[PDB]
Design an enzyme around this catalytic site. Sequence first.
Site, PDB file in Angstrom:
ATOM      1  N   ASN A 164       0.846  -1.185   0.000  1.00 48.60           N
ATOM      2  CA  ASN A 164       0.000   0.000   0.000  1.00 48.60           C
ATOM      3  C   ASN A 164       0.890   1.246   0.000  1.00 48.60           C
ATOM      4  O   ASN A 164       1.823   1.357  -0.795  1.00 48.60           O
ATOM      5  CB  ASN A 164      -0.955   0.054   1.200  1.00 48.60           C
ATOM      6  CG  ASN A 164      -1.846  -1.156   1.363  1.00 48.60           C
ATOM      7  OD1 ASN A 164      -1.999  -1.677   2.469  1.00 48.60           O
ATOM      8  ND2 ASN A 164      -2.475  -1.579   0.278  1.00 48.60           N
ATOM      9  N   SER A 165       0.624   2.158   0.941  1.00 50.85           N
ATOM     10  CA  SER A 165       1.297   3.445   0.973  1.00 50.85           C
ATOM     11  C   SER A 165       2.637   3.448   1.708  1.00 50.85           C
ATOM     12  O   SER A 165       3.290   4.484   1.756  1.00 50.85           O
ATOM     13  CB  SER A 165       0.366   4.451   1.604  1.00 50.85           C
ATOM     14  OG  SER A 165      -0.729   4.623   0.693  1.00 50.85           O
TER      15      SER A 165
END
Lengths: 251, 251
Positions: free
Chosen positions: B56-57
């Site tokens: 993800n981030s």
Amino acid sequence: SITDYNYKKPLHNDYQILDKSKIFGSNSGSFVMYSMAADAYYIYNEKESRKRYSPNSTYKIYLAMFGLDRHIINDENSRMSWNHKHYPFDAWNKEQDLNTAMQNSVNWYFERISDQIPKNYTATQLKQLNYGNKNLGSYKSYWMEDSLKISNLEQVIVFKNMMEQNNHFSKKAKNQLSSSLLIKKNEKYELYGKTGTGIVNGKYNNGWFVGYVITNHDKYYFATHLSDGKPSGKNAELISEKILKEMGVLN
Amino acid sequence: SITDYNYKKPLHNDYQILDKSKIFGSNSGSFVMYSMAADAYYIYNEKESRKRYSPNSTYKIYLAMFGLDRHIINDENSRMSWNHKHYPFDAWNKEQDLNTAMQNSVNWYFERISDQIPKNYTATQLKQLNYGNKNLGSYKSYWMEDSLKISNLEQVIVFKNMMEQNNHFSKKAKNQLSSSLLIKKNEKYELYGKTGTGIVNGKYNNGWFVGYVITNHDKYYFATHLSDGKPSGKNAELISEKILKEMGVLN
Ligand SMILES: *[C@@H](O)[C@@H](NC(=O)/C(=N\OC)c1csc(N)n1)[C@@H]1N=C(C(=O)O)[C@H](C[N+]2(C)CCCC2)CS1
Ligand SMILES: *[C@@H](O)[C@@H](NC(=O)/C(=N\OC)c1csc(N)n1)[C@@H]1N=C(C(=O)O)[C@H](C[N+]2(C)CCCC2)CS1
């Protein structure tokens, strides 16, 4: 010389007079604060705030800036070797970078920077920065209870101006300097600053805490000067913070 | 592909097995931590910690690093203009620099960086970094619930290695990255990190918090992964901190 102990220039900004004498307690001095958003000043004890004292180790701010500006230190490497001389403080007796130098107020780090700076550069910078009396004297530890003197009010004006205005000073210099000054950070605020302490005849005589606060909403420059009582840099920090908290800057 | 969901490589370091199931509560996942000083690992739920999920981030860490390394962004200027497209979050709908991008997990900032990076560079870096399965796929948001996958244990190994080892990545890159990741600072510690959150069918399915802590005495790399329960990046941060506090890393 007779007016070089006093910042007389009137304010061309809105300003309020505070009463933080209860927080200052048995200590004597002043507190100044500037609000970017309000373009306004908040002063306690404006008399004291206009009297000029030696900057002590708050000048390290500017020495650090000059060293970055003359490529004496840089973002890739700001380290300096210890000369294997004992100093009164243990934190001084090791290798330093800007952060460790600044955080521990390692005099010899900035002295070593000072020695590589021409006088005309220094004098040019103080002129453009409006640094206090702009008095270098013999140009030897001039910032340490010597010729150079600045007022609590000017500390805030000169710092804010140098940081916020389009100087010849680069943004990365300012950020690297800013990194070296960060003390506290949380959800609410980033606190930056630098202490100053003077000692004469075993007595504290001159105490600084100069810095700034970034919040979500605003940005503040501030400074506390202590002239009597227990005028140590640490005591100046403690007072700065309880004033900033009680004024609701740190919430 | 049959071994690309699992980090099987045995540990060539000391390690202890923890029990923080009480802190994890009704959430499921793992916690890993490395201690520079002990050259030792501390794992809770090593099974889960070896399973690979999409970063993800948290991948923004590495995208930021690549962008600095290819002079896409600099210490002088890391700003990027908003394209005037509405995003679900307001903090995205403005100008960004690395710090604001990273702090608000502004996807489009790092997407815009991703698009200017050659694939063979990316693939070279993942190889040298040992980043998870090293699988780029179609090379379009590959780090977002797609081909690229990394384990909670690897998050700590890969990050610590990239930061601490004298690779081709510059010191100033690492510092600028480090600045963008600072969350909390006090007398005791500096806390750095990055959250990750996944959403599928309106349900959190994948929660990261990757980072490190600097104390006076030691330096720690850590990561929390949440797989079930309420697996959000924020919940991963909360759990990381309670574990770090209760282990006396934040004291
Ligand atoms: C800058 O203020 C430095 N101060 C000094 O060198 C002086 N006295 O310090 C004992 C000094 C210079 S001229 C003169 N007459 N006295 C350094 N900075 C500070 C500081 O406040 O940051 C020091 C005090 N601390 C760091 C000691 C422990 C907590 C405060 C002294 S050295
Ligand atoms: C990185 O994790 C980003 N996440 C996303 O873009 C995704 N969902 O966000 C709702 C995503 C990507 S693939 C997929 N299936 N879902 C950004 N980072 C976070 C973060 O935790 O830093 C965001 C989540 N927070 C900030 C809001 C709620 C918990 C924390 C979302 S955008």
